[PDB]
């Protein structure tokens, strides 16, 4: 009896027993599964029922959870090499965090050498939010929210399959609303449940309208259980190539090509809390330098320093705020790291001095792969000589011959960033180069790792690693496609196991380079490839996008997913990397892009210039771009405080509407607009030819940003008028945000007067806060060298409370302007008290009753002190 008892079984709960090929009766019979072909090709024709799996043999309680020996039910194999006996272990890590793993007690299988996640042995946790039930015949696990008895994660729906190069487990989930998994192009933030496959294996590929695995390896996803906001997260700690399959019910199935099963289930009262718990586990995001938040200009192939200078000149002339000039691989001599082109980039050091004189920053690209060739003068490439002497390279399977691939400079060897000696070499290369070219930050690219020859110069050995028995739906269906051989050797292990950790290890390595090059500074690291917890070391951008309306639209989902992944400094190539942009598209994308946490206009090789001033000093594009970038720069104290909260508490920066308005099921699918923290709603034009956007307005009071006027919209879908020069910007009632008088660089804006915008809620209250430090020193938060404020308004009294003050230079700044929105009662008098001394009349205010706005001007409320302001 291989089949269910009823002839018309529930099809949505069929678990595919022939996941990898078109279903045939013979293969189904040979695998011992149930054959029932269907109306279509979405529903499985061959499925498992209870034919495969494991039984519990012995189970005992430990001080921190459970341990069960599992024995395999003696059925036919799927892909060979079954592990007959397996050890199931659980850990009640915190009240919100549950962990289980399934290992081989007789063979120490590959485990991810994560540099943050720690060994756990205690302390024993008395009151957990989760209950865990383990069924014995067959083996299954149920994770239950104790408060309402709701099962969150239920594996009894399918078998445990555990074999050397194929691991499989499924879980039924309690709601139809799931978010996360990457890096792929999802198009929609909320997951399509209709039989979708998501492959995960770091890969250099242009994002497009398909399910390809792209640059990062992110298994995390979360699920909102109900309108209460209760939510949970599922994280698999495994870096092997895999597929995540989603079907209606919903059921999620993992199909993984190696390693162990090591799952974390994370409970939260809200979706934001789930994300916070996730970051608590894998590592809180790095605090960026304040300048990282400035607008960046960039393109592949400016071709000469003369062109770079002209681009800089024209955008300065237009008054485009921008902190940073980025230079791509053309700055190098013949695309070799740690060189610059003495011909086309003659005078580069003096150009960097000019940037620095204008208070601007210079960022360079670095690729991991090192040329095996000579320099242009015929001399040895010292970077390679020194790498050879230090034995820093990834080796062939022989464990002694460096593997040769190909990238930009030609044939290349690959640093093993997991090797301590390689980290030192790299730090030393960055330091040597910084004496020649005084760059301020680093963009680390092609670190999947990418290769333009398949596997290596010698091809690949035909073995089980380069050609596994199960191949997930990865692009090309070939493990070593666009990368190095699976049997290549690193300090952390075989490429088969550690491939997806290359970008992760390189960011760690480059973080240590930064500490050598810029002692005790944050600098900037932008990475292409990421793994779980990469946000602790770097920023990310969505990679090599295209100049189309669709790609602009999809960038919001892309951004939001990385927020979930705890990589808050994220954005897309504004105006589009591949292809020529149009004036309309670039103007719209500049508006939206001013509100990416990471804001950079970047262009591919050979297409027309798309920096803002190129469209004309008097263009509508320059005017619109200058205006929204000035708004961005004005809001940087607010944005920066969000990054402080991400770094310390795991809160998101660019935030899904769902995170604030989960009580409203309309927010569950909302992905064409987003929030900065809880307080600012950004609604872009995303369709060619449009001056009107169908927008969902959540259940809050909203004030138009530019005019302060209350919108007559609440908890409704509106047709928002947004003509050519307008993007939708609304402030939410109940929040107080800090601002600073803007300038064209953050270097200048940081010296300017501060202000506060109070957007009053329904009961005329509001709250918020403000973090301020030197903007650059690593560990200011750890060492307590910062200023911290809370703000609170009720009944026409603003309280400004300094809860921490240990940054003397911050003290030279002052709040000089207070704006109150939605103020319904007239103002007779404004009074100010400092440090609980008596109130003095303040004469400079304007009460606009038509607009309900109170402007209080010419204040001098110095940072470091407490104030009260009454109207
Ligand atoms: C902002 O200012 C407004 C004034 O415009 C101010 O409103 C007042 O608040 C108090 C509450 O602190 C109200 O007093 C309550 O009145 C209701 C009847 O209307 C009673 O039910 C309440 O008694 C209960 O609660 C007490 C505890 O507060 C218990 O001791 C008692 O046994 C009862 O359980 C209570 O007396 C007052 O009526 C209003 N006035 C007006 C005009 O509405 C408001 O509190 C201020 N808001 C903030 C944020 O501070
Ligand atoms: C890759 O191959 C090189 C040898 O070509 C290995 O280099 C050794 O590195 C250690 C330092 O850690 C030296 O003490 C040895 O002398 C080196 N061996 C030789 C023969 O030069 C390197 O360890 C290999 N890397 C990996 C991870 O396999
Ligand atoms: C598929 O089959 C079932 C009964 O076997 C039927 O209810 C359903 O309508 C069929 N699907 C279609 C679209 O014909
Ligand atoms: C007060 O407002 C007036 C009106 O603009 C202005 O001229 C004056 O300089 C302001 N500032 C101070 C500090 O009083
Ligand atoms: Cl810095």
mmCIF file of C-alpha atoms in Angstrom, residues 198-349:
data_model
loop_
_atom_site.group_PDB
_atom_site.id
_atom_site.type_symbol
_atom_site.label_atom_id
_atom_site.label_comp_id
_atom_site.label_asym_id
_atom_site.label_seq_id
_atom_site.Cartn_x
_atom_site.Cartn_y
_atom_site.Cartn_z
ATOM 1 C CA UNK A 198 13.512 29.248 -5.465
ATOM 2 C CA UNK A 199 17.107 28.052 -5.980
ATOM 3 C CA UNK A 200 19.822 29.415 -3.661
ATOM 4 C CA UNK A 201 23.521 29.275 -4.622
ATOM 5 C CA UNK A 202 25.564 32.501 -4.985
ATOM 6 C CA UNK A 203 25.793 33.306 -8.675
ATOM 7 C CA UNK A 204 26.942 36.134 -10.953
ATOM 8 C CA UNK A 205 23.909 36.748 -13.185
ATOM 9 C CA UNK A 206 21.889 39.772 -14.402
ATOM 10 C CA UNK A 207 18.635 40.003 -12.406
ATOM 11 C CA UNK A 208 15.632 39.394 -14.706
ATOM 12 C CA UNK A 209 12.075 38.087 -14.875
ATOM 13 C CA UNK A 210 12.849 34.492 -13.860
ATOM 14 C CA UNK A 211 13.651 32.424 -10.763
ATOM 15 C CA UNK A 212 17.443 32.378 -11.149
ATOM 16 C CA UNK A 213 19.687 32.171 -8.137
ATOM 17 C CA UNK A 214 21.629 35.436 -7.973
ATOM 18 C CA UNK A 215 24.348 36.943 -5.810
ATOM 19 C CA UNK A 216 23.373 36.230 -2.225
ATOM 20 C CA UNK A 217 22.459 33.084 -0.287
ATOM 21 C CA UNK A 218 19.560 33.966 2.037
ATOM 22 C CA UNK A 219 17.336 31.166 3.436
ATOM 23 C CA UNK A 220 15.407 33.303 5.914
ATOM 24 C CA UNK A 221 11.686 33.823 5.557
ATOM 25 C CA UNK A 222 8.942 35.027 7.807
ATOM 26 C CA UNK A 223 5.208 34.464 7.984
ATOM 27 C CA UNK A 224 2.455 36.647 9.472
ATOM 28 C CA UNK A 225 -0.009 34.398 11.340
ATOM 29 C CA UNK A 226 -2.837 36.858 11.848
ATOM 30 C CA UNK A 227 -4.127 40.395 12.095
ATOM 31 C CA UNK A 228 -2.863 40.410 15.729
ATOM 32 C CA UNK A 229 0.621 40.704 14.216
ATOM 33 C CA UNK A 230 1.987 37.444 15.668
ATOM 34 C CA UNK A 231 4.626 36.231 13.274
ATOM 35 C CA UNK A 232 7.522 33.807 13.082
ATOM 36 C CA UNK A 233 10.686 33.292 11.059
ATOM 37 C CA UNK A 234 12.369 30.181 9.684
ATOM 38 C CA UNK A 235 16.108 30.247 9.120
ATOM 39 C CA UNK A 236 18.156 27.310 7.738
ATOM 40 C CA UNK A 237 21.873 27.465 8.550
ATOM 41 C CA UNK A 238 23.233 25.745 5.447
ATOM 42 C CA UNK A 239 25.430 27.125 2.644
ATOM 43 C CA UNK A 240 25.090 24.224 0.169
ATOM 44 C CA UNK A 241 23.228 24.777 -3.117
ATOM 45 C CA UNK A 242 19.527 24.198 -2.517
ATOM 46 C CA UNK A 243 15.999 24.824 -3.655
ATOM 47 C CA UNK A 244 13.105 26.116 -1.573
ATOM 48 C CA UNK A 245 9.749 24.974 -2.935
ATOM 49 C CA UNK A 246 6.428 26.595 -2.016
ATOM 50 C CA UNK A 247 2.990 25.081 -2.651
ATOM 51 C CA UNK A 248 -0.537 25.965 -1.564
ATOM 52 C CA UNK A 249 -1.668 25.150 2.016
ATOM 53 C CA UNK A 250 1.128 26.540 2.235
ATOM 54 C CA UNK A 251 3.861 23.898 2.514
ATOM 55 C CA UNK A 252 7.524 24.792 2.187
ATOM 56 C CA UNK A 253 9.949 22.075 1.100
ATOM 57 C CA UNK A 254 13.746 22.344 1.314
ATOM 58 C CA UNK A 255 15.864 20.282 -1.076
ATOM 59 C CA UNK A 256 19.530 20.675 -0.245
ATOM 60 C CA UNK A 257 22.644 19.161 -1.823
ATOM 61 C CA UNK A 258 24.839 18.697 1.252
ATOM 62 C CA UNK A 259 25.564 19.723 4.834
ATOM 63 C CA UNK A 260 23.156 19.144 7.743
ATOM 64 C CA UNK A 261 19.711 20.391 8.667
ATOM 65 C CA UNK A 262 20.150 23.246 11.160
ATOM 66 C CA UNK A 263 16.967 25.268 11.611
ATOM 67 C CA UNK A 264 16.044 28.222 13.797
ATOM 68 C CA UNK A 265 12.398 29.062 14.441
ATOM 69 C CA UNK A 266 11.997 32.604 15.704
ATOM 70 C CA UNK A 267 8.828 33.892 17.369
ATOM 71 C CA UNK A 268 7.736 37.542 17.476
ATOM 72 C CA UNK A 269 4.702 39.555 18.505
ATOM 73 C CA UNK A 270 5.047 41.549 15.261
ATOM 74 C CA UNK A 271 6.875 41.073 11.920
ATOM 75 C CA UNK A 272 9.483 43.654 13.033
ATOM 76 C CA UNK A 273 10.219 41.596 16.183
ATOM 77 C CA UNK A 274 10.831 38.507 14.026
ATOM 78 C CA UNK A 275 13.389 40.437 11.965
ATOM 79 C CA UNK A 276 14.994 41.704 15.213
ATOM 80 C CA UNK A 277 15.223 38.122 16.560
ATOM 81 C CA UNK A 278 16.809 37.023 13.321
ATOM 82 C CA UNK A 279 19.525 39.724 13.579
ATOM 83 C CA UNK A 280 20.052 38.902 17.236
ATOM 84 C CA UNK A 281 20.949 35.375 16.033
ATOM 85 C CA UNK A 282 23.113 36.044 12.945
ATOM 86 C CA UNK A 283 24.587 39.446 13.920
ATOM 87 C CA UNK A 284 23.297 43.006 14.150
ATOM 88 C CA UNK A 285 24.079 45.234 11.117
ATOM 89 C CA UNK A 286 27.180 47.463 11.134
ATOM 90 C CA UNK A 287 26.644 51.160 11.865
ATOM 91 C CA UNK A 288 27.516 53.054 8.635
ATOM 92 C CA UNK A 289 29.642 56.223 8.546
ATOM 93 C CA UNK A 290 27.341 59.199 8.176
ATOM 94 C CA UNK A 291 28.871 59.936 4.734
ATOM 95 C CA UNK A 292 27.907 56.456 3.478
ATOM 96 C CA UNK A 293 24.373 57.911 3.407
ATOM 97 C CA UNK A 294 25.252 60.652 0.926
ATOM 98 C CA UNK A 295 24.368 60.278 -2.761
ATOM 99 C CA UNK A 296 26.999 58.503 -4.917
ATOM 100 C CA UNK A 297 27.865 58.978 -8.642
ATOM 101 C CA UNK A 298 29.297 56.059 -10.557
ATOM 102 C CA UNK A 299 29.611 54.283 -13.857
ATOM 103 C CA UNK A 300 31.463 51.467 -15.497
ATOM 104 C CA UNK A 301 33.975 52.941 -17.942
ATOM 105 C CA UNK A 302 34.261 56.727 -17.603
ATOM 106 C CA UNK A 303 37.351 55.765 -19.654
ATOM 107 C CA UNK A 304 39.602 58.596 -18.482
ATOM 108 C CA UNK A 305 40.169 60.824 -15.455
ATOM 109 C CA UNK A 306 39.274 63.782 -17.742
ATOM 110 C CA UNK A 307 35.726 62.389 -18.160
ATOM 111 C CA UNK A 308 35.445 61.718 -14.395
ATOM 112 C CA UNK A 309 36.429 65.370 -13.751
ATOM 113 C CA UNK A 310 33.848 66.662 -16.211
ATOM 114 C CA UNK A 311 31.102 64.553 -14.595
ATOM 115 C CA UNK A 312 32.088 65.864 -11.141
ATOM 116 C CA UNK A 313 32.271 69.451 -12.455
ATOM 117 C CA UNK A 314 28.837 69.491 -14.067
ATOM 118 C CA UNK A 315 27.015 67.928 -11.088
ATOM 119 C CA UNK A 316 28.727 70.326 -8.647
ATOM 120 C CA UNK A 317 27.652 73.146 -10.991
ATOM 121 C CA UNK A 318 24.012 71.961 -10.903
ATOM 122 C CA UNK A 319 24.075 71.898 -7.086
ATOM 123 C CA UNK A 320 23.379 68.148 -6.999
ATOM 124 C CA UNK A 321 24.070 66.954 -3.456
ATOM 125 C CA UNK A 322 26.593 64.115 -3.629
ATOM 126 C CA UNK A 323 29.201 62.902 -1.214
ATOM 127 C CA UNK A 324 30.953 60.301 -3.262
ATOM 128 C CA UNK A 325 32.560 59.672 -6.581
ATOM 129 C CA UNK A 326 32.958 56.011 -7.407
ATOM 130 C CA UNK A 327 35.400 54.630 -9.872
ATOM 131 C CA UNK A 328 34.864 51.171 -11.529
ATOM 132 C CA UNK A 329 37.500 48.857 -13.115
ATOM 133 C CA UNK A 330 38.631 51.366 -15.802
ATOM 134 C CA UNK A 331 40.720 53.282 -13.161
ATOM 135 C CA UNK A 332 43.000 50.233 -12.895
ATOM 136 C CA UNK A 333 45.933 49.355 -15.103
ATOM 137 C CA UNK A 334 44.482 46.578 -17.352
ATOM 138 C CA UNK A 335 41.788 45.838 -14.768
ATOM 139 C CA UNK A 336 44.321 44.660 -12.150
ATOM 140 C CA UNK A 337 43.547 45.286 -8.470
ATOM 141 C CA UNK A 338 45.867 47.643 -6.578
ATOM 142 C CA UNK A 339 47.083 49.482 -9.674
ATOM 143 C CA UNK A 340 45.888 52.565 -11.481
ATOM 144 C CA UNK A 341 46.112 53.373 -15.188
ATOM 145 C CA UNK A 342 49.142 55.734 -15.466
ATOM 146 C CA UNK A 343 47.960 56.884 -18.916
ATOM 147 C CA UNK A 344 44.179 57.405 -18.744
ATOM 148 C CA UNK A 345 44.206 58.086 -14.970
ATOM 149 C CA UNK A 346 47.440 60.099 -14.752
ATOM 150 C CA UNK A 347 46.928 62.553 -11.862
ATOM 151 C CA UNK A 348 44.428 60.366 -9.954
ATOM 152 C CA UNK A 349 46.020 61.147 -6.548
#
